[PDB]
Ligand binder design. Structure first.
Ligand SMILES: Cc1cc2nc3c(=O)[nH]c(=O)nc-3n(C[C@H](O)[C@H](O)[C@H](O)COP(=O)(O)OP(=O)(O)OC[C@H]3O[C@@H](n4cnc5c(N)ncnc54)[C@H](O)[C@@H]3O)c2cc1C
Ligand SMILES: Nc1ncnc2c1ncn2[C@@H]1O[C@H](COP(=O)(O)O)[C@@H](O)[C@H]1O
Lengths: 252, 315
């Protein structure tokens, strides 16, 4: 089997973001970036599938500007076989959404004859939780979203998914798309040997136009702003006082 | 003239409360509101929805093909409905059900969808959060169909009486059969459902054990509260994943949220920071949680929680 894993470069999770004074978006220049944590989980699962000798080849893909290559290099270090960078200029990378990414992924999925597309369930920046579902939709493939367990069953996938009440289990006919929940696995640390190795591995650069993907968008950011400010309230000395206060404001 | 289709969420012949908040969002658009009920048993849910305030038309799709609400099966149904009735807007609550379904529908309609909206400013303009609730993004959508999920906690529930919607059967669709639903494992308890609960008590890593978590159940019991958890509590095995609150878990905005032995990491704050009253119980006066808590006590949770529980037994 062949796997395509989509990995996104995003502002690092521990970062305090700053909104631009012009209100067009958040500051990203000079800010620490890293692989989206859900993407990392998707790469680790793809690699575990190879280690179980059920997957022959793992192809890592990132869509966006030059620095995505680092994100791809990271996936390669984690055990992906080769990379594709779908290059987009910085200005147009800002207009790049799930719709566009999903179109690219669907084209690559068909082009590279993949059996499974793995993604994170969401990107911690746009918080969309859309790409995997849309990719599946364009391909007419089944989707197993928010996966916490994946089991390959011949030409079929058994996926345990996180749902509001607990879990559920589905069986999908291959080819399929799966998006990874945080519970799925614990991504490995990429050792320096593995990183030096990954420098030998290949990255192909392509343009969305090369795939017949048009980037035109009918969505548009009007503005981006700070949410209301909320700072420290009051300290209470005793549990009795805490209960007293909550009762008098009518929350108990 | 806006015309909105709300996809009803239901399981076990019961309407999910989040669909009621979603109907409210839909009224912000000033037009006609329809609601589609697809499933294997739809009579009670449909009947119930025909009493919900704000709905003009209920459409009912009862078929065994909809067992487990597979989006591979529901999506053709929705596309068939849209083809017939040409809605300007299609929506659902941004639960797991809605997050799963709507972006696939948007793909098939070839439109960019919008997730987890917190406000409708106009038929084409929406507000949503990004970067784990740390920025508000206002989006304009020029798509022929606006496909969006709704943050349930941002809109009040539509009344369950006073409605008089019409009901009609929908277009049955042919089995796609590329996916199949096998089983489920639901966490069941006496507690109210986390996302609608008036009071939530949450435990993080400070509880040290799953056995210690019983302290929080006992407290919650006195408050008739739901119990949430941080990721650390889930990972350390204290509680099942479905009670996780935050960016990757459930978003909750209870009247009262009590954060017990939770530091207040960005990713946890994503899911509770719009709670009306925030209380922190934490031994670390530098815990970020204290920078959003209305009321805080810097003390050992093993003392405070049992005490609170005993006080609450009286009045
Ligand atoms: C992609 C991603 C998504 C994430 N999503 C979520 C999410 O949805 N929800 C979530 O919670 N986390 C999420 N996290 C993890 C998050 O970043 C934090 O690691 C987690 O929230 C920390 O949980 P905690 O507060 O319980 O642990 P800690 O940060 O270790 O806090 C423990 C607290 O317990 C207190 N304490 C210890 N003993 C006592 C005592 N005896 N009495 C009183 N207080 C005591 C300590 O002072 C401390 O503040 C996510 C992380 C990533 C990378
Ligand atoms: N620019 C991108 N390049 C590659 N993969 C992406 C990109 N954006 C999103 N994805 C994939 O889709 C998942 C969900 O993204 P989103 O739908 O934006 O929340 C991510 O974890 C990625 O695996």
């Amino acid at each position: 089997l062949r796997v395509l894993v989509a990995v996104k470069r995003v502002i690092d999770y521990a970062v305090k973001i700053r909104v631009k004074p012009d209100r067009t978006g958040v500051v990203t220049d000079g800010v620490k970036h890293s692989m989206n944590p859900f993407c990392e989980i998707a790469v680790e699962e793809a690699v575990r599938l190879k280690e179980k000798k059920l997957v022959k080849e793992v192809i890592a893909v990132s869509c966006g500007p030059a620095q995505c290559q680092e994100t791809i290099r990271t996936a390669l270090a984690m055990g992906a076989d080769r990379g594709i960078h779908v290059e987009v200029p910085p200005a147009e990378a800002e207009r790049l959404g799930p719709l566009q990414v999903a179109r690219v992924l669907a084209k690559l999925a068909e082009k590279e004859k993949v059996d499974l597309v793995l993604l994170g369930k969401q990107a911690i920046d746009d918080d969309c939780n859309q790409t995997g579902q849309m990719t599946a939709g364009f391909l007419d493939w089944p989707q197993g979203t928010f996966a916490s367990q994946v089991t390959l069953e011949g030409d079929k996938l058994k996926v345990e998914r996180a749902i509001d009440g607990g879990l559920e289990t589905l069986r999908l006919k291959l080819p399929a798309v799966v998006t990874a929940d945080l519970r799925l696995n614990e991504p490995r640390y990429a050792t320096l040997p593995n990183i030096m190795k990954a420098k030998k591995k290949k990255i192909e650069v392509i343009k969305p136009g090369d795939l017949g993907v048009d980037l035109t968008s009918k969505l548009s950011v009007i503005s981006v702003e700070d949410p209301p400010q909320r700072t420290a309230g009051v300290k209470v000395e005793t549990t009795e006082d805490l209960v007293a206060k909550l009762k008098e404001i009518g929350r108990i | 003239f806006q015309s909105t289709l709300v996809i009803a969420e239901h399981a076990n012949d019961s309407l999910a409360p989040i669909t009621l908040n979603t109907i409210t969002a839909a009224t912000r658009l000033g037009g006609e509101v329809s609601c589609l009920v697809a499933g294997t048993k739809c009579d009670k849910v449909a009947q119930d929805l025909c009493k919900v305030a704000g709905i003009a038309k209920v459409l009912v799709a009862q078929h065994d093909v909809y067992k487990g609400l597979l989006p591979e099966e529901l999506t053709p149904l929705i596309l068939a409905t849209q083809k017939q009735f040409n809605y300007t807007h299609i929506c659902a609550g941004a639960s797991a059900f809605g997050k799963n379904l709507l972006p696939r529908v948007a793909a098939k309609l070839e439109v960019a969808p919008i997730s987890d909206i917190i406000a409708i400013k106009s038929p084409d303009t929406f507000v949503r959060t990004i970067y784990a609730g740390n920025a508000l993004c206002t989006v304009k959508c020029d798509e022929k169909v606006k496909v969006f999920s709704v943050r349930g906690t941002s809109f009040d529930a539509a009344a369950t009486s006073g409605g008089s919607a019409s009901s009609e059967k929908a277009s049955s669709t042919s089995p796609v059969e590329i996916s199949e639903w096998l089983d489920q494992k639901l966490t069941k308890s006496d507690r109210p459902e986390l996302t609608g609960a008036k009071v939530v008590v949450s435990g993080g890593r400070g509880l040290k054990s799953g056995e210690n978590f019983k302290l929080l159940y006992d407290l919650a019991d006195q408050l008739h509260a739901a119990v949430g958890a941080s990721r650390a509590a889930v990972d350390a095995g204290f509680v099942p994943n479905d009670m996780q609150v935050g960016q990757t878990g459930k978003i909750v905005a209870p009247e009262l949220y009590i954060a017990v032995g939770i530091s207040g990491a960005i990713q946890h704050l994503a899911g509770m920071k719009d709670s009306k009253t925030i209380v922190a119980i934490n031994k670390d006066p530098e815990a970020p949680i204290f920078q959003v808590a209305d009321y805080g006590i810097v003390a050992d949770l093993f003392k405070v929680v049992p005490e609170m529980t005993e006080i609450l037994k009286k009045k």
